[PDB]
Structures are given as C-alpha cells and as structure tokens.
Amino acid sequence: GLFDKLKSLVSDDKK
C-alpha cells in the first residue's frame, strides 16, 4: 500500500 510500491522500485536500480 506504500513501501510495497517503494521496495519494488528500489529493488533494482540496475537491470
């Protein structure tokens, strides 16, 4: 609902 969409954004930074 929040960090879930935040953790999914930071879970990359390089792909």
User: How far apart, in whole angstroms, are the C-alpha atoms of residue 4 and residue 15?
Assistant: 19
User: How far apart, in whole angstroms, are the C-alpha atoms of residue 9 and residue 5?
Assistant: 6
Experimental method: NMR
∠ CA(2), CA(10), CA(8), 5° rounding?
50
Amino acid at 10: V
CA 11 to centroid of chain Cα atoms: 5
User: How far apart, in whole angstroms, are the C-alpha atoms of residue 6 and residue 14?
Assistant: 15
> What are the Cα distances from residue 8, in Å, to 5, 14, 15?
5, 13, 13
DSSP 1-15: --HHHHHHHHTTS--
